Amino acid sequence: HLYPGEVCPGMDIRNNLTRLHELENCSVIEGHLQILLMFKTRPEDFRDLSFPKLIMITDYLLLFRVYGLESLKDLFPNLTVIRGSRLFFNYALVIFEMVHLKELGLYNLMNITRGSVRIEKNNELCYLATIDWSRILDSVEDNYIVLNKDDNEECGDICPGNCPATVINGQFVERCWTHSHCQKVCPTICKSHGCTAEGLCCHSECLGNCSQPDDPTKCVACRNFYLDGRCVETCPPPYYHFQDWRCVNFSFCQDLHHKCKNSRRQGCHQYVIHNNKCIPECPSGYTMNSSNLLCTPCLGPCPKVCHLLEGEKTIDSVTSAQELRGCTVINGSLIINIRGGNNLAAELEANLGLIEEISGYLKIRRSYALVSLSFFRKLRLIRGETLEIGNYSFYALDNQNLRQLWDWSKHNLTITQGKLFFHYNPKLCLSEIHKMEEVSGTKGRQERNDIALKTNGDQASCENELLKFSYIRTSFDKILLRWEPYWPPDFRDLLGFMLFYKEAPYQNVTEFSWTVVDIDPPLRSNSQNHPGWLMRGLKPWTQYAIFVKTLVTFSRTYGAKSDIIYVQTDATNPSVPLDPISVSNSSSQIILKWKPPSDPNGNITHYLVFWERQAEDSELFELDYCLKGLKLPSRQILKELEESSFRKTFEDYLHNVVFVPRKEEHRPFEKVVNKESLVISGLRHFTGYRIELQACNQDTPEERCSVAAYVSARTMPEAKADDIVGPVTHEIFENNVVHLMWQEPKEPNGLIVLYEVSYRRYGDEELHLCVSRKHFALERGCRLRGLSPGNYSVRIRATSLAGNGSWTEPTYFYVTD
Amino acid sequence: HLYPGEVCPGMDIRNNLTRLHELENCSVIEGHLQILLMFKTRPEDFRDLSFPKLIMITDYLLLFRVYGLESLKDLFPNLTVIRGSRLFFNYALVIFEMVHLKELGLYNLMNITRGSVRIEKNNELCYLATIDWSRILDSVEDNYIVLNKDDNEECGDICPGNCPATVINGQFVERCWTHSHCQKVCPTICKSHGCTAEGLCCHSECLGNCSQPDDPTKCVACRNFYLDGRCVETCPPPYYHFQDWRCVNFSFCQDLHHKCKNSRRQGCHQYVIHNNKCIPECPSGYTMNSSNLLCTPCLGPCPKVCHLLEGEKTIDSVTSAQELRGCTVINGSLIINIRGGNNLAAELEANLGLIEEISGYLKIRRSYALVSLSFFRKLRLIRGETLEIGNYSFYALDNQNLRQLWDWSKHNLTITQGKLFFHYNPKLCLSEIHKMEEVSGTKGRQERNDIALKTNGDQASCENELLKFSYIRTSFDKILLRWEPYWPPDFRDLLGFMLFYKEAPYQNVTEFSWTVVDIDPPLRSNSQNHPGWLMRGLKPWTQYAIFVKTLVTFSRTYGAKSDIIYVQTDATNPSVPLDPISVSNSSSQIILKWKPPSDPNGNITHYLVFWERQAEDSELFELDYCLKGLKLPSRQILKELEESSFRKTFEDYLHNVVFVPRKEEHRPFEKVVNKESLVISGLRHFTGYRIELQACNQDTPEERCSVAAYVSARTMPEAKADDIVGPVTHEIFENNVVHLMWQEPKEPNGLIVLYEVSYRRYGDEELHLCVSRKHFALERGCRLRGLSPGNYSVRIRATSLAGNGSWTEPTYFYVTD
Amino acid sequence: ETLCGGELVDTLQFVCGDRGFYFSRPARRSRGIVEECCFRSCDLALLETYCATP
Amino acid sequence: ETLCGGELVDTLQFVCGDRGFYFSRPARRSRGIVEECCFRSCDLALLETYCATP
Amino acid sequence: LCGGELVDTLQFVCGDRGFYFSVEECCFRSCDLALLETYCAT
Amino acid sequence: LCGGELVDTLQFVCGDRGFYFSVEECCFRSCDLALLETYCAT
């Protein structure tokens, strides 16, 4: 839908809500909105005010100490898009010292074109972590939200969700604005074109929200431009773009320029026309034409001078630099001081970089996020007419991240007067400064203690002297190092080389953990001896990153370093397979589990495992198990530097004074390949096994195998293996001696230790007798003596290693009465 | 004895030994001896040369690259004392690049008056660690002996020793010069007066060695002065002291002055007389008198100007400063650069400190051992006529130990032109620099970046703002901290306080281990809230040193610190006495040993120990010990700082923009006091004991006692306690049933389990029977059945817990045949 | 006594009171409030001059 | 090529050779040998001028 | 540190003044003595 | 490290060149490869 209402260019409301009524008819704001400094206000005075008509803010929104305000859900229920043409300290929405605020309430915000959001020191605001700034902004990392109620307190983020949720770092979370509304999230096919509640994609030109999908006539905010409701990407003539958000007829711009001309408002601009754009003033190379409002190109190279108040301007924010946008010649001096933490290269290059000459000096102090000075794209000449105090033209102080000053393969520069000045730039190096001095042409304009040697690049390896490695080769376990000798012009200044080495998982490692080792400087060969060094201890088959840096006393420093060379050592034998556990589920199936060794030290080609048969314990055969006690088992530095320097200086003094000028057992085995487990079949019942477990990580070039691991596995017995089979034959002598015959269970559960014979006569009781192995052998079974006359019912129980077998069926034998 | 021979003033021998013959008649040397630069020489050319006459060297001895020399024991067999009036780079004996030297050989050196010894880079010299420099020099720590054969190699120090030995650090070692001679060490009663071979003390005036003890007439070197052999402490008139080692008649000094006057030697001095001293020139305030050689005081304040070549002089050694001794006004500039490691305050104060005005500038660069600039005792004015490059008058650079500049309570200073300059003085602080600026009067002569704020005193706590502690009190286990609030002029700059604490054994601890903890800055009270902090974990009853230092961002720095306050926490209970071991040696004596607990946590007042009686194991009574199986037991940061600064700067920008100006069971116990052991008496034989060991470190204010420690102790049995006593009465029934009666050993070795009765008839064998506790109780003894007719010899063996008792005597009883 | 941000607003509306702070138009001078009262000490009149009606 | 202490003596007595180094008397100028050959490069003639006879 | 045991710290920092229970600020967070001093009210 | 085991280092730093025995410089001192390279002579 169109925007019915006065555009009402941006204003601010202070000291009373009676000034808030100017927005009674406002669909858009061509400016910035500031509501701040409200003290004598109460929440009872805010329940009535509401502005459903407000849709889009051009510049920014700032709220600063508005007492009594608890939520904006009643103030701006239709704030869709904040254009952010000009920011407030590189911020598009600032909410500062916002006492009494509970929830943000901006449940209609969709897209912020340019800028960031800084909300802090509210002391009462929650419902912040329950929002998704990724779909709102374009650079989330530039946000700044601290010192709210969310962190130090625990304001419960109770909200429907029902409402859509999304991941942030590693978990999903609902994205809700207030207790009743939530952020509208719809499929990514409409990146920014908007989408209806159902999910239909809006028009491509459209933005944020729309009523009729794929219809620019019924949109609420369209990204490109605006004209007569039915907005288009770029309006045709005779309509010229205005303020980067809408276009109007030439008559509008002409009468606005006439109004500014005749009414000498101090803030009015003589608007001109240049490429269908009613801009405040066209850039350098064009002149205001009295006849027609457009500025034709001039027949002369006249730049657009940029006069500066009091000859100075501090650049500490995007909005500070934006005042120089389009300017090309500065009639003053620039001091850059960006106290940040987020780089501003993009916006600085967009606003600056069109300047060519600086009348005064350029000063860079305390700036942090500046990684380079490349944003001065077209900086050519520094006149230095307004010289800095101390007679300087270039400055540098406490730049923590000034890496590169300029690219001198292509860039040009010129300094007229003054001298350079660099101090405490740990990421800037003297090579770049000396290139500064050579290219500028102020070589003879330098003095002592203007470019500190010990502060610039103190933590940046940039001595720019390369060192090669002669030859290296790695063995099974260790590695030998050797490199070409290096000597400064005065060889006594070399105190030895630093060696840096660490394990690098992947092919890239940061340059300057990092274990180091001292190296004794080599003897003066004056044949040359390569210094070399031998490492001590390492983890085999790992990627190692090594490099050597010389260490030379500061007298000019002429150190040297080597490239980061990655050296791969060899593999070795593995360790014991971790956690060797063997289990049995079936009579012949035993399942053994293991884990790969803690240090495999090589690609495990196969596992060599052996299962071995054992005999029953020798002492078991010689132990009787009917005797009482028959429990059968149920089987600090500066001093050294000064010492060197003192030795050198005494030698120098001596030389000065003295000299004057004239006037196998085949246990079954299997190569377990690509498996940390094994299942074995075909095992005897109730028989133990000795399992020898070992691993190898190399097969074809000889089996490089680990040590053996011993575990014990025992199988369960069969069902009816211990029962006595065969007839129970008995021999009766003249003394009624019963000599029992029975065939032993040739395949028992380990071994049968004893037998329990229970013979009972009709009306008599049950007797027992032990039949040990020696008893069963020497007597060839049992030998009963002294049996009363009558027929006895005999049950025999066989006692094996597993336990007592099933009783034999009652056998009846009749002796004479 | 006297010195027969020409004094032969000091010379040097180079390039041939044919110049070494000038010392054919030389008992003393009034100068320095230098033998150096010998290349075409061989050891075969050194066996002949010997100088037994040389006794004392005035200045120093230097040997530099004398090839073919292997030992000085044949060159200087009588070098007794080196006076060291003037040194060679603050060294009295230099041996440098001394190839082919094996042993020093100076077996006659006794005392070096002033200086040190530097021997290095010989590559062949050993027999160095076998010497005692303490009896030779007066300042051993000023020596410098490195890079010899002694360290990198293992030249065997085989020597007699026989020869005296002495301790150095923790062990004795013989002190030998060569393989045949050793350092002469004699009792300390003769500190330096000398002593004969037997041990008799020499004369008090004498020094080093003497022939007749307590006789100055027969000495070889006397410390004070010399005259006509029989030297005296101070020769009377008309003899005037000469060159601080001897005195001569006035005629000698007069003719020497005349010789220097008429013969215009460039090095000769017009010797004068001043206080019976033929000195080269008397100090400021005296004028050369043509009539008589002494210089009378003048009627005018004319100082002794000290003209300097090329207006500069570098002070890097004692001998460099000695050239200015006696000088008071410098017609040039002084640059002090002492690359050292040993302080030179004493000698610098002796030589310097008499200077008052400096025409040019004074520069101090790279000096290390200088702890203060107090050696400029009478420095008053710095004219600065010859200004330093960059227009400076005072300099400072890389002074690692410049603590204090001057004592401003009494000292005065004056600087005419130039400006101060301080950089990289980690031990010097801005307070002293500003006091310099105020006292000098050059306050308006300063510019930016001449006195770096971040380099001077960066590692010296000197913000000189004191912080008090409100109240503290320490409990049984922990301690609470609280102090008065502090606020810089801009309160946003306070990021919190640093807390430093460590355990200090004794009352003194170094100021700035040292565990630290971050403190959150307190809320703005605008009643004031004391910040305070609580400790977490400590070792009780220990002396703790605590102090708090504020941490404020650099914008002027206005930090604050507190005094080192020592807080003593309280004591607690001790631990278990370490290694509780109990042993027994006698029937009633059990000796138990223990160690004090690892953490006593208190003065151990006494040990509370209990021994308790136990009963025999219940299952023992119910266990039969004749059954088979009878085994009876034989019983990184800058990001946070920038976050704070960025928050502050955004708040400042907001304030700038918004506001505009208008137009108990009694087990016996004993309190073991002051003993880690105990011996207990009166214990039953063969009875165990349960020992409960515990310790207490507090008695009168309630017994603060540790936990109990349980150990087991068993006593040995008696001699004849298990033997059966009383007659072996037997009752015989009609069935010849023998019922044995015997009285049990009421006090046995624990308990008797069984009995072994062995009755044997004449010609029969021995029988056995078990008599268990139940057998002995129910049957009231033993009950034998079925004994063959005849008289049996009965031996009874009692089986107790200890073992089998002695057999009873053969008892004979006759049954009817 | 110097006063800085945070508490500067608290001091304001108390020294000024009742009436607010005037505002005409932006019309940077860089002498606004911080380098008047925070960096250097400022008196009552320099706060009163930021009022609206008087 | 610059040469410094230690090896400076080795270079001497080879460039000079046979004859030694002259010595008259101390008669500090501070341009002796180190700032002629160690700090800055020095040629053959500057070493030859330290000989005795020539 | 948690409830029951934590009472010693409150009696340490408050003495003979007493306190009301609430451990959620020390079992998971760090005891900074700022909450402890205001836990006990006169 | 000491004799017997130390031979691997000499074969490492000398290869197929061989060496003569002498351990007194590595059992108590530190092996800096300066002595090892000169231990084996061609």
Author numbering:
A (entry chain A), B (entry chain B): 1 to 161, 168 to 518, 528 to 541, 545 to 573, 577 to 656, 691 to 718, 766 to 919
C (entry chain D), D (entry chain F): 6 to 32, 37 to 63
E (entry chain C), F (entry chain E): 8 to 29, 43 to 62
Reproduce text from the manuscript describing this model.
IR can be activated by two highly related ligands – insulin and insulin-like growth factor 2 (IGF2). Consequently, IR-B has an additional 12 amino acids at the C-terminal helix of the alpha subunit (α-CT), while IR-A lacks this segment. Here, we present cryo-EM structures of full-length human long isoform IR (IR-B) in both the inactive and IGF2-bound active states, and short isoform IR (IR-A) in the IGF2-bound active state.
To reveal the mechanism underlying IGF2-dependent IR activation, we determined the cryo-EM structures of full-length human IR-A and IR-B in the presence of saturated IGF2. The 3D reconstruction of class 1 (determined at 3.6 Å resolution for IR-A/IGF2, comprising 16% of the particles; 3.7 Å resolution for IR-B/IGF2, comprising 14% of the particles) exhibited a T-shaped symmetric conformation with four IGF2 molecules bound at the canonical site-1 and site-2. Our cryo-EM analysis shows that, even at saturated IGF2 concentrations, only about 16% of IR-A particles and 14% of IR-B particles adopt the symmetric T-shaped conformation with four IGF2 molecules bound, while most particles are trapped in asymmetric conformations with two or three IGF2 molecules bound. Structural comparison between IR-A/IGF2 and IR-B/IGF2 complexes indicates that the site-1 and site-2 binding modes of IGF2 in IR-A and IR-B are identical. The site-1 binding of IGF2 is mainly mediated by the interaction between A- and B-domains of IGF2 and L1/α-CT and FnIII-1 domains of IR in a fashion similar to the site-1 insulin binding. In addition to these interfaces, the C-loop of IGF2 also makes weak contacts with the CR, L2 and α-CT’ domains of IR. In contrast, the site-1b interaction in the structure of IR/IGF2 complex is mostly driven by the salt-bridge formed between Glu12 of IGF2 and Arg539 of IR.
